[PDB]
Write a protein that holds these residues in place. Structure first.
Motif, short mmCIF file in Angstrom:
data_model
loop_
_atom_site.label_atom_id
_atom_site.label_comp_id
_atom_site.label_asym_id
_atom_site.label_seq_id
_atom_site.Cartn_x
_atom_site.Cartn_y
_atom_site.Cartn_z
N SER G 1 22.29 -62.82 1.76
CA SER G 1 22.29 -61.49 0.75
C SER G 1 23.56 -61.25 0.32
O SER G 1 24.46 -60.55 0.89
CB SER G 1 21.86 -60.27 1.79
OG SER G 1 20.68 -60.49 2.41
N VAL G 2 23.53 -61.79 -0.83
CA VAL G 2 24.99 -61.70 -1.73
C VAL G 2 25.02 -59.86 -2.20
O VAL G 2 26.04 -59.66 -2.46
CB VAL G 2 25.16 -62.53 -2.86
CG1 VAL G 2 24.79 -63.83 -2.34
CG2 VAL G 2 23.99 -62.30 -4.04
N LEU G 3 24.01 -59.34 -2.02
CA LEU G 3 24.08 -57.87 -2.41
C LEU G 3 24.07 -57.25 -1.17
O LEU G 3 23.12 -57.42 -0.54
CB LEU G 3 22.72 -57.47 -3.45
CG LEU G 3 22.93 -58.22 -4.76
CD1 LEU G 3 21.74 -57.89 -5.67
CD2 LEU G 3 24.04 -58.02 -5.48
N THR G 4 24.88 -56.15 -1.21
CA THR G 4 24.91 -55.08 -0.14
C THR G 4 24.49 -54.00 -0.25
O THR G 4 24.53 -53.09 -1.36
CB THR G 4 26.54 -55.08 0.32
OG1 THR G 4 27.17 -54.08 -0.54
CG2 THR G 4 27.42 -56.24 -0.02
N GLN G 5 23.54 -53.65 0.68
CA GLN G 5 22.93 -52.34 0.79
C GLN G 5 22.83 -51.69 2.33
O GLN G 5 23.14 -52.40 3.22
CB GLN G 5 21.14 -52.61 0.45
CG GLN G 5 20.86 -52.17 -0.85
CD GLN G 5 19.21 -52.48 -1.07
OE1 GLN G 5 18.99 -53.62 -0.59
NE2 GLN G 5 18.74 -51.57 -1.83
N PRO G 6 22.86 -50.38 2.02
CA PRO G 6 23.12 -49.65 3.52
C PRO G 6 21.96 -49.77 4.24
O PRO G 6 20.39 -49.68 3.56
CB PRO G 6 23.24 -48.16 3.12
CG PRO G 6 22.60 -48.07 1.60
CD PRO G 6 23.04 -49.45 0.88
N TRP G 100 16.56 -65.65 -8.37
CA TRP G 100 16.62 -64.22 -8.00
C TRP G 100 17.66 -64.39 -6.56
O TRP G 100 17.69 -65.30 -5.71
CB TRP G 100 15.45 -63.53 -7.53
CG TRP G 100 14.25 -63.47 -8.56
CD1 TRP G 100 14.69 -63.67 -10.02
CD2 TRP G 100 13.02 -63.15 -8.47
NE1 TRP G 100 13.44 -63.43 -10.81
CE2 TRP G 100 12.43 -63.00 -9.83
CE3 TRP G 100 12.15 -62.85 -7.37
CZ2 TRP G 100 11.00 -62.81 -10.12
CZ3 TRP G 100 10.87 -62.60 -7.48
CH2 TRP G 100 10.42 -62.73 -8.86
N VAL G 101 18.37 -62.96 -6.51
CA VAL G 101 18.99 -62.80 -5.18
C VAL G 101 18.70 -61.69 -4.86
O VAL G 101 18.77 -60.65 -5.70
CB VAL G 101 20.47 -63.08 -5.43
CG1 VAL G 101 21.03 -64.53 -5.77
CG2 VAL G 101 21.10 -62.20 -6.09
N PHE G 102 18.33 -61.21 -3.54
CA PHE G 102 18.02 -59.96 -3.37
C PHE G 102 19.05 -59.26 -2.25
O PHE G 102 19.95 -59.88 -2.07
CB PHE G 102 16.52 -60.04 -2.39
CG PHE G 102 15.59 -60.21 -3.40
CD1 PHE G 102 14.71 -59.05 -3.64
CD2 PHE G 102 14.90 -61.58 -3.34
CE1 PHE G 102 13.50 -59.29 -4.53
CE2 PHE G 102 13.75 -61.52 -4.20
CZ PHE G 102 12.94 -60.49 -4.69
#
Lengths: 112, 121, 55, 121, 112, 121, 112, 121, 112, 112, 112, 112, 121, 121, 121
Positions: G1-6, G100-102
């Motif tokens: 997961s290259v994108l960081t989410q809380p 895509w990256v999620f």
């Protein structure tokens, strides 16, 4: 000819001579590289020095170059009979719309 | 080995056109830009024109702009120079050079043999 | 500027490209096409056919 | 599992040609560019050539341009390297590598086994 | 070999050693990435570090690297006997016509 | 209305194959590319593969390339995924999504119901 | 997961909450679009926002999104009972070979 | 003189199908693609569908895809539009236009007279 | 209606009017052509301008148009009593899956 | 003779020689197969290689060939005395109305 | 023998085994159908699958098959004692002058 | 007349004259070939140069031509008395639905 | 020789728009930026606008910002000046000049002929 | 005429975020930096933040640094101020001003209307 | 709010190197220079090094020049300190501080938590 060179330089075989190529604040004083070419009397120019210090494979160790401020110099140590040619300096002038600018050209005569 | 051979010279009266050429061999032609340089008899070298590797960008000297045209044909490894409205001062030996770039300025590592163009009446 | 080709570029295919058919293409027949008989085809053209009376 | 297997080495007299190949399996060959890297006995690594994923672009080192030729066949998942006018300085172990690009430079992410090309008289 | 490296580095097992790869202002000082390869004595090179900090799945946490200015360094902590291999730094030089430029190569010998 | 239906899931021991299918209706199948996305139980979403509208290009995730194969049949409006050498890490729910593209990145506008593929022994 | 989410975000019904998605210079900071998906506990994902500002027909006006710099945000105003769902941010990463990256996935719970 | 004559309109209660036609004369029908465009009463123009000259490629608007079907008969020089499951939003005036392409976008040079379809309960 | 048009414009007979068609960076700012149509109150549209500068045989020299940047405008000189009609601009939008996108539709009123 | 072949080649017994066939972008570089024929000094030509890699049963394993770009080459290893013959290359040219195009013809002489 | 089949495969009773037939771009990858025949040791071959998915009435529902690209497979579930027989894959080759081409054949063994 | 030509040029016998043909970005600048035709006053046109450089058997070596960018030209050297004819340049224009497009036609007058 | 020729002038009532153009020949149009300069009758010169060689940057004078628009089209070697909501103070003779840069300030080496725009009622 | 229109105000409880915007017209937005200035009810003016024309440099007041974030999108001529962790003394009227520079200090030539942001519980 | 967090301490024998890092949060890192200050157990404070905001300028104390190296990464908001050839006299607690300047002298407005470096045999 935005770069100025002496019209002629001479010397007997065995010693060192210098060819100067003075410039200005727009070409050599602006941080642009200086390259040197050699043209034998009946042939096309041949690259001699690039990057102000580097030489290609075919060029011997006798030729060396350096620059400081708005001036550049070419040092030829140990003159031989085969060094008689015209030497041109090349740079880029910011005040024009041309890729290259050449010097006047200095004819080297070996006092045989 | 890098080989640049030029042709298309000769004698032409002033006021009309002439076309030069510079055939190449020994390297990938479509990867490099090229130059044209001329030398008047007894004088120094003078830069004339450059063309990009893909032919998108062309630059000309102030004394030849609007009259000379530089082009290339990547499928034949040939560099052209279309010279129009020739004048007396355009009499010189023309060279084709291969473009190289070092740090902040360019140079020509490999040169052609040269062809002589004489404009006279 | 540098007039030469750049060797430091991505040499791989781009996955971030449009994967759908283009609606903005020419929908009309091409008038600039070879109108001749193409003397390059299988001259022994009995490759495979239905051997029965009906399809 | 990415597998790169090379062949075509041997001993060749100087002055004549030799052809190397690098058969591939375990990935989509047509999606990736490829490199050739050689290592002289007892020396370091030297980059030789690259080819784009569609074969549209080729780049060569200054020491082999005009003599070597890199090509690919996407229908057989094979990479080739045609070496002409072989010299003694070309004796080394040749590796085929799979190209990858990170931010501002590229690297080789899987390598082949390597093959030995010997030029001697 | 535009990128220069120490010809050899040695260290005792269990300690930390450093392999440096310093270049100029055209390859590493120009902002291009540095990648590391490991070549065991009898096989082909294997990727060790890419993107100046990242490592593949097979590479253990012992290896790490970083760059600053015109130099890049590879840090190996806690040497083993199986760490004897040649290490090469790879980048891109703006002054050439090649995709990769390699370093000289540093041989690591673990003093077992 | 766009209606994507998946099938072909089930329970399989590790080491052998399984072939899924995503039958579609309500739109022109041959004008669009398709995606596969999998979600591990209790985890996030993971992109698996893409196929072009004509089948010319295929892209795979790094963890599935060489083992998975994506294909389509424009005459039956059915998308396939051939999964070979299954591992326990491949147990998840697989979705087929219709491709779309906005400016610089693509998304998925309509998704399938999903199918469960589990690998255990 | 290259994108960081809380991992989780909560709020009382009727108030405004924000889900953030922070990337790097290769995915969001490079100029690529960010799209949002909504997954209810027992169903497949549904497209929520595409193009960083636009929404499909079924999506109500309550959901909105934007992006700036290296981060993007999904803003929900007027929380309701049915908005308990997982929200994913998707973009494209220049450093991979995938379409895509999620993101990690943020679970939203309204305090009902 | 290019003529596009239309028919097939009328009053249809929502939930069932209607078929239109656009008879052609005065040009080579098989060499050109065709469009359908609609105009709701008091509204602007909305593009509906297109068909290729050979019938290979069909494209529909997002609001009509899956319900409308466009087809052609190259031997009768006629064009069809098969509308299924009509909604009240489908009431408009339907035109057939001949395709054209200039540089990077297409237009319609010859339009039909138009037919009007009313759907209401 | 992606392309934006003012709902109405008027002018006195013999004067010049300018009808505008403004889009975005995907349709007109992306390099695609703009085409103009004219619709009399009770008839089907007729082609007016194609290729942003060209016009069919039946169209007189009064109508003219051009495009620049994101904006494309139709310039009409010498207003007549028969020039009262709805004028549409049409182009191609990259972000959908349709061949043509139209404008809202301006009505030209001649102050007779 | 759009395909160019060397007029004569030579090779000592037991050495390796190559026969080259050079075409253009219309015949060999356009994706058409190249075929090779061998003709004894006193009889009709006989098929030697078809499909750039394939040979009939009669042809020994010594004869092999391949194609690349706009050029083709026939490789003969282990030259024998009976290898003295004329070798032709054949392909199809797009710009003409002929099924076959032949080359100049290469004569192989063994330096016995 | 243009088609390739494994010499022999084996499996436990009731399990699923895969028999594959790998062709080329000229026979299977060219879009031609693949037909499967089951030959008992003591009688003539019997038709098993035609049209790549269709089976005769006599063939039980356990037998099934599909094809993709240049390869086709025969999937057999619930292996029984009577399943021990030779299986052949059949297609049509464009490069030959034969209606049918037969593969090597697979001998199926059940570990009873 | 999509292709533009000078209506008339002239030159004395024995000199070199140049007939040009100017096109656009859709016909000549798109990469389509240019062909030349010669029409004597009382007969049908005759093919002069095809393929932008090639000539038939009957055409003498005097006629030659090339293209560059959006323009192509026919160079004639050694003017003769029989060179009195009309010269037409032909290409294919992508913008229409016709196979050929002809120029206006340039008349060459020999200054006898 | 460098030739700059303008057009599009005339008489216009205040409050409406007018468009100017400056057609060029004798130099590479896409290698240079262009200026606009105006001169009210019996007064001095005034700088109006500039555009970059690629059209990325535009700068306007304070008195004309928000109303005037400068643009170029590199395919026809022409420069445009779109004037909107002209005022009485906008009556002047407008020149197109070619941009040059020496050390720290720019100048115009080649000027046009001039066109007259009158705003009156 | 320079138009600066702010929006996005209202009443918000302390401890949470709010986003302001300032839409622009009448000048080239991408050529100018912007400022934010706030005025507490009954108090003087206070400088908040500035953003460069390209967005490369950002500066914040010491009393708001770490909580506020200024940003711009040159493609829609909009300026943003993202306020996080709003406190009670953040209640003021916020203006967007166009940057200017005279000799050694900067000023603001054109201002917006201003919106009220109230933080209370 | 300004938080400076330090990590990378421990025990290291003399003669070799250890690396330190000071992660930053709560402000724009690229807008400020930073400092390193050390305190040996039971002694006072000693200034070690300063680095400019862009990293162009570097300074070191006389007792550590030629052995220590200071650097920053503006894209990760982290400050570095590379100390080579550590000696016993280097045992101290190292602090990272944000630079500030009042009139003629500098000061540190915010300080980090600190880390301990032990060099012993």
């Amino acid at each position: 000819s935005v770069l100025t060179q002496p019209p002629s330089v001479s010397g007997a075989p065995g010693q060192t001579v210098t060819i100067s190529c003075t410039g200005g604040s727009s070409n050599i004083g602006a941080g642009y590289d200086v390259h040197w070419y050699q043209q034998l009397p009946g042939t096309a120019p041949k690259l001699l020095i690039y990057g102000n210090i580097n030489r290609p494979s075919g060029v011997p160790d006798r030729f060396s170059g350096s620059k400081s401020g708005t001036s550049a110099s070419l040092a030829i140590t140990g003159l031989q009979a085969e060094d008689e040619a015209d030497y041109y300096c090349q740079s880029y002038d910011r005040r024009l719309s041309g890729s290259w600018v050449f010097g006047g050209g200095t004819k080297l005569t070996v006092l045989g | 080995q890098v080989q640049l051979v030029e042709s298309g010279g000769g004698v032409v009266p002033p006021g009309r056109s002439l076309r030069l050429s510079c055939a190449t061999s020994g390297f990938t032609f479509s990867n490099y830009g090229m130059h044209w340089v001329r030398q008047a008899p007894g004088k120094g070298l003078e830069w004339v024109a450059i063309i990009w590797y893909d032919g998108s960008r062309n630059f000309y000297a102030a004394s030849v702009e609007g009259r000379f045209t530089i082009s290339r044909d990547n499928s034949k490894n040939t560099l052209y120079l279309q010279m129009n409205s020739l004048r007396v001062e355009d009499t010189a030996v023309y060279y084709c050079a291969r473009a190289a770039y070092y740090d902040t300025s360019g140079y020509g590592d490999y040169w052609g043999q040269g062809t002589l163009v004489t404009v006279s009446s | 500027a540098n007039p030469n080709a750049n060797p430091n570029a991505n040499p791989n295919a781009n996955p971030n490209a449009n994967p759908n058919a283009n609606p903005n293409a020419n929908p009309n027949a091409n008038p600039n096409a070879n109108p001749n008989a193409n003397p390059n085809a299988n001259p022994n053209a009995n490759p495979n056919a239905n051997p029965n009376a009906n399809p």
